[PDB]
């Protein structure tokens with residue numbers, strides 16, 4: 243089960259996040275800047291199988307629902323995006339991976355002098371983005387090893403030092419509400 247609660251916001255707009263029982267959380271936001279809220283594990287694993295049920299995911303504008311985390315050495319931000327609002331995230335196309343009943347496009351991207359778990363840094367993003375939005379309110383599994391190994395085949399090797407790993411609600415200049423249980 244989960245051991246970690248993440249509640250990060252850049253302070254722009256109103257973001258109200260609740261650390262509920264077990265692996266459950268909720269977040270309501272209005273005209274946010276950027277925020278990342280979710281539950282998961284303080285140390286990510288490339289072989290973790292993550293389950294979640296989004297009782298609600300209703301962005302009004304740009305919001306994502308993703309398996310989300312960081313490695314260091316090198317500094318990499320990674321996503322497995324199952325749902326989004328008005329904006330589907332993309333980068334440089336690398337291929338596809340089919341996992342847990344969905345097909346995901348794979349992308350890389352460079353972020354130059356950008357916010358990160360270690361402050362302003364130049365780093366890389368690894369993305370799997372579902373080709374269509376996954377069903378909301380169902381018990382959904384992300385078999386992360388499939389994504390890790392699909393990424394490896396394209397030279398997207400994750401860092402050797404693992405930071406947190408969560409099912410994250412992320413908003414960008416938007417409003418919305420989400421309620422999610424992770425295990």
Ligand SMILES: O[C@@H]1[C@@H](O)[C@H](O)OC[C@H]1O
Pocket residue numbers: 250278357358359360
């Ligand atoms: O973990 C936070 C990350 O989610 C955000 O993107 O940049 C600052 C970090 O502390």
